Symmetry: D2
Subunit: 236 residues, 4 copies
């Protein structure tokens, strides 16, 4: 069969095969709250990674892995708007939250440069785009393919629905270097899609960690970043 | 594991686990040509089904199946336009091409009515929309979710690329009755998506056959309908 | 992923993805009764509705496969006939004309004809020398290749009415076919392994399934398979 | 699909999703040498675990997991005999080699008692059975199901073949609490089998680590303990 394949229909408190970084944790109702949700709403940053590294490419054979992932998340804001967003990403094996990272960078970047050493590929679901604080963002809530920088190489308008469950399917096909993001809201049939070319071998190291990250830059514009389930499979 | 799961990376001439109806066949280059391609072009209709029925729902337990399928196809037209389109469908087990069917109906319908007895769910990739002959179609090449009728319940503009390979992922999630179509062109990043609500239990019988169908209504406006690979999985 | 993979936790009456041959059918309790239960002589086979490509003539590749199933053989007296078998045969093959229960509806004779193109793992309950001269002197598990006279057998510690779990694996690279049987009830286990070159015996496209028979109504027993998992890959 | 499923056709030097304990490592030829192989030969103990914990049972729902694993190993001895053996095991998440463990205990036990706190289930392929040093062992090379003690609850004669590759399939079926070990030698058709009843919920904690361990108690009677490939899948 395939190299790796795991599925979580729900999460359990202190799940031992998920590494929790920052304020990420799983509530008693079985949902992964990557971003903290509490009594007085507070600023927050969190990441959750699957406990075992994944070989995304082989230097011996030259082979690159194809992978697919599916997850459902909810972003519920108190007012009609919230910050900062959520992201699915691939980073160097067992990487830590960069020193001096902000919610607007989802705990993935130290700065707004496009440093080659970052070695990060992420699909962001950006809810905040204020030019004052996030000058790199377009003028709307978006879905962006990030490659070594918080300034997405390609974005698309995200028709975010407050409090509604969104189903996402991301697929990467090694032979064509095609990364496709497929988002839909079963509630009303709203759908958004985006595809970009990315050479994993050129950006990432052989061994990577996969997971979710998110942040809340301003407690006044609070919103949740809850992932309900997660399926992942890769194959060299 | 899951109830069923099959994968074809390429096809073989006279593949014994695919039922060929009409002019459908697989070339020596290993591609499923649902529609006939020849020296002097001709009118054509064809369907190809996986040889074994699939239980899409259980009358005993009440359970409904969730399924996902992925395939890549190419539609290459001689001129800058072609007819008639291609479709992925679920029909009653071992059903035959309806008597008196046309290319515009992809060999799935006898008429343009919405008869409940048709028991057909299909995702069409419609290339012809002329009002003279296809009065039910919108004013552009589209992707449509068909339920018991050639007049789609929901469509979306399909940014068809002549001769380019398109990757499609269709998922049906029983719990939310959500059918999502995800199409993308690795060549230039063009992507189209559509989602609709469909209750399989209400439309289809317990046992169904899945496959592709397509047609060429006018030999003068010829185009191919080739599927390169196919992955399918269902689970009750 | 793999070329094919299916799983049946239980069966349904008139399951449309199983081809029923002979007296095979599935009861309302969801069990595949390959052999008729009511009393009478019987022969039956059940195949998965779609052919499977076991090897490619273009590339030369051979498929590795694994299957798991649980069956029960309940006899009225302390003994029964005739046995059950899991097999691979030419695509959509029919029960051979003039076949007997002792041959499980897989063979026309007791010869080793190359044209039979059949590989089967039998769970033989009858071994009387008068009628089954090819069989050893005990209930056995045998690897059959083009003949009812197994190329290799092993004593089968059959337990009347108990559920047996079986796992069969074929690893193409080493041409190794292994049968793993166990009884969760009391821990009884039997195992057997043999070398078989599928490419040499079978055609490219085959049908897989179960077959069984009851040669004498007086020594009745059931041949019920409760579940079935199968997966192959080229 | 299933909760977890991974497959290694070969191993890579310093594989990042395998935790190496003791002298375990993977050679350049891609084989997991759980026990050290060098010239001059030396006493050795080693363990290799999959990097991520696995939930073997849920305290909330009461559910127990069914799992299956397949691997191929080779035990090549210099003389006509070797020590000490190899083992596949399930232990508490991220457990370490017990302080004061010996090769005869495969780096799994501190003593020869049957302490309930050990929380270990292992299938051993014991090559040494000398009564002087291993008084608990039967009078032949064996396969044993160990539950919280090096004194197996059930054994069977193991017809070990020097230097030959052995294929093993272990399955645990939660509903019947049945653990079955299926070993065979493709080389000559030699096969050994053993089955026992084990209630995982009663022995192990919810989260466990799975892997291989082995030892060489006496450098004079050296032998290798190499696993060539490993497939594992579990499901709650
Ligand atoms: C950004 O993060 C990296 C990695 O932790 C660190 O080396 C670098 O110093 C950080 N930048 C700043 C200004 O701290
Ligand atoms: C449409 O197809 C159905 C099924 O083959 C058939 O019964 C019906 O008569 C057809 N309509 C016409 C006009 O033939
Ligand atoms: C044995 O079965 C084959 C296949 O049906 C048939 O051709 C042959 O004639 C049978 N033998 C006899 C004696 O009928
Ligand atoms: C046996 O191992 C356990 C766990 O490391 C340890 O607590 C115990 O002290 C060990 N026994 C001895 C004699 O060291
Ligand atoms: O007595 C038992 C035997 O009865 C015969 O009629 C039959 O051909 C044999 O296969 C076996 O069933
Ligand atoms: O001769 C082999 C034996 O050597 C002993 O020193 C050791 O305690 C035993 O476990 C075994 O390794
Ligand atoms: Ca932002
Ligand atoms: Ca049309
Ligand atoms: Ca017999
Ligand atoms: Ca020992
Ligand atoms: Mn952004
Ligand atoms: Mn249309
Ligand atoms: Mn026999
Ligand atoms: Mn022992």
């Amino acid at each position: 069969s395939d190299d790796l394949s795991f599925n979580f229909d729900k999460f359990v408190p202190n799940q031992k095969n998920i590494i929790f970084q920052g304020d990420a944790s799983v509530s008693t109702t079985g949902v992964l709250q990557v971003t903290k949700v509490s009594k007085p709403t507070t600023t927050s940053i969190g990441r959750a990674l699957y406990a075992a590294p994944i070989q995304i490419w082989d230097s011996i054979t030259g082979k690159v892995a194809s992978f697919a992932t599916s997850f459902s998340f909810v972003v519920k804001a108190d007012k009609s708007d919230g910050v900062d967003g959520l992201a699915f990403f691939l980073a160097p094996a067992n990487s830590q939250i960069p020193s001096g990272s902000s919610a607007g960078m989802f705990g993935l970047f130290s700065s707004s440069d496009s440093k080659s050493s970052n070695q990060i590929i992420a699909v962001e679901f950006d809810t905040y785009f204020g030019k004052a604080y996030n000058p790199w963002d377009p003028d709307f809530k978006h879905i962006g393919i990030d490659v070594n920088s918080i300034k997405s190489i390609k974005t698309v308008k995200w028709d975010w629905r407050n409090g509604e469950v969104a189903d996402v399917v991301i697929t990467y096909r090694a032979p064509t270097k095609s990364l496709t993001v497929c988002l839909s809201y079963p509630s009303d049939g709203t759908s958004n899609i985006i595809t970009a070319s990315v050479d994993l071998k050129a950006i990432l190291p052989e061994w990577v960690s996969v997971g979710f990250s998110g942040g809340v830059g301003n407690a006044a514009e609070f919103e949740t970043h809850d992932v309900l389930s997660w399926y992942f499979t890769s194959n060299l």
